[model samples]
Target: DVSGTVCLSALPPEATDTLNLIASDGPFPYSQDGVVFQNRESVLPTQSYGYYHEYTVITPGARTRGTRRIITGEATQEDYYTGDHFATFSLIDQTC
Candidate 1:
């Protein structure tokens, strides 16, 4: 019942902000930000090497960047999140 943008239920405020930054092509904070998501564990559906990219999800009051992440695919309909590094992922839908 909408056009553009995505809704990630139960996603943290920082994560939501990062997601928005993603769709906007990012003024991303981390220098290590926006790197290719290799899908090394093969947990994410298989894809060509450069087809996916990742961004950070800053954890509140954490000493480091933390394990949380937002990864996007080919710049399209599917996106995913992982709170435990790349240990797991949940889809965040965006209807293109």
Candidate 2:
């Protein structure tokens, strides 16, 4: 596995569920699911303001949206996972 990259199968089940919904152009679980990700943390590669969108990964024991998220890059369709809010990111490598 490359640094800052995670295999598709290694992601949490909830993350995969979100990914599937994204693929299907879903009625997502949250109203904020597909909102633009501002990249405020600057962890992800720089892009235009609307280039990235975020999806929540439901955490089993959390009340809120939780810290985990799947942020999709619109142009490249690349998925990045963040476990601790937006402090860091791991690009999801779907090629297993």
Candidate 3:
């Protein structure tokens, strides 16, 4: 079995307002392949946004659990002004 918490940070007001139209209000859902969030607006100077999501997966019919993995990815629109936008993922595992 595997479980953990995720954290998200919102971009500054200027940035969030521009993107609010495309941003999704959560509790967002997760999937085997990946999760997708919308971002239609541009990120302005001193403006940033982010999201933290948490998930848990249990092996089916396993008394002594096997291996578990949590993979994550993020994609963003290209910005001419800003440097780069990236998505990160962290993982934890347990054997019981």
Candidate 4:
């Protein structure tokens, strides 16, 4: 399981807003938004395939979907947020 914590307000507005979308079962903006996250990077604890999913955390005024993302897991629905793409991840509150 992913470890650590992130304040809901400490996140970018788009990130918190995206959390709402995730809770609501999103009408995501990008095609890749809801794709499976292959955690080959081993950032989070190991889990079976399909246990994890990903969504875009929109960047303000960017050409692409931006590097930010919300990566969530099915193990009690833990959530990990990555502000700098997948290079690093921070566990968001279980509220996800």
Q: TM-score, each model?
A: 0.84, 0.89, 0.18, 0.89
Q: Which stretches of candidate 2 lie over 4 Å from their true place?
A: 1-3
Model 1 over residues 6-84: C-alpha lDDT tens digits?
4575678787788789879889989778999898878877889988888999999998889999888885667788888
lDDT of each: 0.79, 0.85, 0.26, 0.83
lDDT of 3 by residue, 1-96 (tens): 112222212222332222232244323222421232232232222222333221222235656322322222133531111112223222211110
Find the candidate with the highest TM-score and give its number: 2
**lDDT against true structure, model 1:** 0.79
Off by over 4 Å in 4: 1-3, 94-96
In every candidate, how many clashes are there? 0, 0, 5, 0
Task: List the candidate 3 regions with Cα displacement exceeding 4 Å.
Answer: 1-55, 63-65, 76-96
Global local distance difference test of model 2: 0.85
* Backbone clashes in model 4, listed as residue pairs: none
For lDDT, the strongest prediction is 2
Pairs that clash in candidate 2: none
